[PDB]
Amino acid sequence: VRDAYIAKPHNCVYECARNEYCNDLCTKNGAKSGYCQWVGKYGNGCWCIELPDNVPIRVPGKCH
């Protein structure tokens, strides 16, 4: 498992305005919990705790 921004196609974050939205998105995908980052590595977006390894995450590179 890993803690990371959960990705949507292709190598993009899910933006967010509140923590519960991210908690729900994360747990639906198997993570323990999640919250909304504002000033993390990739800016605004959902961050998941203990996301299963085969769920895509945001990594270095361009989103589109």
Next chain:
Amino acid sequence: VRDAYIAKPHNCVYECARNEYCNDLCTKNGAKSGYCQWVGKYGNGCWCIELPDNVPIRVPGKCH
């Protein structure tokens, strides 16, 4: 076509913090354009202009 909040499965909005994120999402799904609406019927989320009828929208009920 209708102006509406585009839905993420299942009956969820896409939350947002910048307009390009919504315009990108809405136009990929065939809308004329879209923007990040902070306040509205279904609170913060992407609002699309003239989304095609076959693309789900947020409707009453809970996101799941």
